Amino acid sequence: LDPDTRIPVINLEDGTRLVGEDAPKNKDLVEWLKLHPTYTVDMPSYVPKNADVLFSSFQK
């Protein structure tokens, strides 16, 4: 994914949901996550591509 790819997430406690363009950037994603340990990813599936759909062994 692009570091600019928006990641649709939601904070369950505050009830804030950020999807689409309001969703945080993939680069800031990790930082936002540390600020929100009470968050949950709203959509855990981005785009099934290439060979990522074979197995689930995420070595790389």
Q: Are 44 and 17 in contact (CB under 8 A)?
A: no
**Cβ burial, residue 37 (10 Å; 0-12/13-18/19+):** exposed
Query: Among positive and negative, which fits the CA dihedral 28, 18, 36, 48?
Result: negative
**Cβ burial, residue 60 (10 Å; 0-12/13-18/19+):** exposed
Domain extent, residue 10, equals 1-60
Which residues, at least 6 apart from 3, have a Cβ–Cβ distance to it below 8 Å? 25, 26, 27
Q: What is the CATH number of the domain that holds 39?
A: 3.40.5.120
* Amino acid identity, position 53: V
Place of tokens 């290439």: 50
Count the domains in the chain: 1
Tell me which long-range contacts 44-51 makes (C-beta under 8 A, separation of at least 24): 46/1, 46/5, 47/1
